[PDB]
């Protein structure tokens, strides 16, 4: 015969959703140098990287972090005044034909009975002509705040961990196309490094595919899911702001010091980016060869620049040395494939509606001296044109905007599960 018996602490899990916690802010619990990766054996676990909730959680966490970083900073509400502007004409080239615009304006001082007369060099995209009088871009939509100069906010590794009764499962398989039964599985106490990078159309920095390029999509063929392309090898990219720029303090009240552009030292030129043309060519060749699997071995492919929309999505948008770079990637995604250094012009901004929100606009202070940013390009975010086209070249265009997808580029190997440690079974033991 057989009798029930209760086994406690039994290796059984089920998918579930709960809060996680970081490891590495002023509140992160420090990690440890023991990345204990117990290789689960003879296991095979279903994965769906498109619905692991924690990515959204991470997104939400980042949002809140950003907000709490900005709240104890000066609010430039008095700054919304009429601007007497003049187009700059000092050592200005034919590329940047009137982007910087030095604008005088009256500004409040410590004693609001008195005022002063100060200047600036706001970029064009932030100023709009109200009628020669201009206003800052945000002064009618949303309030304006400034980033505290202390924080040099940038990608800092933020490991993740599960809270004492939940497990984090990796997928060590190197051909994981994002969905299905992953054959090789291993748990970890905490996740590896994930740089919380903010980039659209081009996933700057991060983790590269171990063996070969990979194309991920919840459905490759429905022209409405942002395709992720993870590279096998990195692509070197160098972005530069070569205009020697200074910074000045202006007293906006009892202690509120607004950091404003004073004047550009020396010459002025366009702030541009460079990528090795040959390596980019080889990597895009690799990408199209991989795409031939999903779209057949006899399909023409076309690459065309972004199709339109907002400034943040129409262009490569990212952070570089405190400034916000908006590079026009029409100079790369222009090609066709049948069955040296590329140079990218880039614009700059000082008013950013980050996280595509409405009501919270952040002012990015300038940074003294020229700026350089060397980085590894690790993957792209593409979308298929469509048009059906009978059988014809299928066109791919850069996409992005929804930053969550970028988080999915590093949170696809992982999943969170809950342990059910109270099992039962039959055995020949009787009380």
């Amino acid at each position, epitope marked *: 015969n057989l009798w029930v018996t209760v086994y406690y602490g039994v290796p059984v899990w089920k998918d579930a959703e709960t809060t996680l916690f970081c490891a590495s802010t002023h509140a992160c619990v420090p990690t440890d140098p023991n990345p204990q990766e117990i290789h689960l054996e003879n296991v095979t676990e279903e994965f769906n990287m498109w619905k692991n909730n924690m990515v959204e959680q991470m997104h939400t966490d980042i949002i809140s972090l950003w907000d709490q970083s900005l709240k104890p900073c000066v609010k430039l509400t008095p700054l919304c005044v009429t601007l007497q502007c003049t187009n700059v004409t000092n050592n200005i080239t034919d590329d940047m034909r009137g982007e910087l615009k030095n604008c005088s304006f009256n500004m409040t001082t410590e004693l609001r009975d008195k005022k002063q007369k100060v200047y600036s060099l706001f970029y064009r995209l932030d100023v709009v002509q109200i009628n020669k009088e201009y206003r800052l871009i945000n002064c009618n*939509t949303s309030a304006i705040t400034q980033a505290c100069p202390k924080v040099s906010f940038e990608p800092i590794p933020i490991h993740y961990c599960a809270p004492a009764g939940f497990a984090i499962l990796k997928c060590k398989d190197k051909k994981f196309n994002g969905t299905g039964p992953c054959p090789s599985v291993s748990t970890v106490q905490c996740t590896h490094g994930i740089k919380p990078v903010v980039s659209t159309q081009l996933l700057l920095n991060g983790s590269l595919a171990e063996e070969e390029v990979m194309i991920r999509s919840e*459905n490759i*063929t*429905n*022209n*409405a*899911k*942002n395709i992720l392309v993870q590279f096998n090898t990195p692509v070197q990219i160098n972005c530069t702001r070569p205009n020697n720029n200074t910074r000045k303090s202006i007293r906006i009240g009892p202690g509120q010091a607004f950091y404003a552009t004073g004047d550009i030292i020396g010459d002025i030129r366009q702030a541009h980016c460079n990528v090795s043309k040959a390596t980019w060519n080889e990597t895009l060749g690799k990408v199209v060869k991989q795409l031939r699997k999903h779209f057949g071995n006899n399909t023409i492919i076309r690459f065309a620049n972004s*199709s*339109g*929309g*907002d400034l*943040e*999505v*129409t262009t490569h948008s990212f952070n570089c040395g405190g400034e916000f770079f908006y590079c026009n990637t029409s100079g790369l995604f222009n090609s066709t494939w049948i069955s040296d250094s590329i140079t990218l012009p880039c614009r700059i901004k000082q008013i950013i509606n980050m996280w*595509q929100r*409405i009501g919270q606009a952040m002012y990015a202070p300038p940074i003294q001296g020229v700026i350089r940013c060397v980085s590894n390009i690790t993957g792209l975010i593409l*979308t298929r*044109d*469509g*048009g*059906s*086209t009978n059988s*014809t070249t299928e*066109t791919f*265009r850069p*996409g*992005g*905007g*929804d930053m969550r997808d970028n988080w999915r580029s590093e949170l696809y190997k992982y999943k969170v599960v809950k342990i059910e440690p109270l099992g039962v079974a039959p055995t020949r033991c009787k009380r």
Partner: antibody
Amino acid sequence: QVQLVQSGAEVKKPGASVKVSCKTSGYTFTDFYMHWMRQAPGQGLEWMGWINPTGGGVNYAHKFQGRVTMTRDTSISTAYMELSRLTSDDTGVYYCARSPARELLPLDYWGQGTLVTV
Amino acid sequence: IQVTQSPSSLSASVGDRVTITCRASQGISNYLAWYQQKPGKVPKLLIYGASTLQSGVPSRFSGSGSGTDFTLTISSLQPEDFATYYCQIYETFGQGTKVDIK
């Protein structure tokens, strides 16, 4: 309630540019993508394109690429479209439709409907 | 994605079983939707997500299938029910079909 008003009937001559509008009320504008559709008189309903009201992302189809351009306005909760370099075949009815998230099949609810005479 | 509606033309009477299908190229699982467009009025959605139906839809309207072939079927038919119907797949809308009394 959820209401999708659409622009009025417009009449025109070939070669110019024509603009249409679709105003929404009753739901979170940025949550649902917007498809634009067109049907020629007594014909099927060909898909003009789709737009994302979160960052302004848009995708057209080649059949109608390089001629169409659509944008969004989050303040009044509206979606605008324009067509340039028109051809006589383009005469017909245009529609605005609503799809959840980054999905394209369920075209729940619809606009009043615009007619364009090329 | 090739879409072939069937039948192109159809005449049916009040209260009868009427079925309409559309052939696809490859398999799309539940990914399918059917709509109606009464003449003059705006098109409205009948079925989505393969069998799944819309809210406020009478249960007489029901679709299902698999692979390349699916079918929307109706048993009861009140006079407003007949209209032009449209099968849809990806960016490959069906040509449509004509439903008339008797």
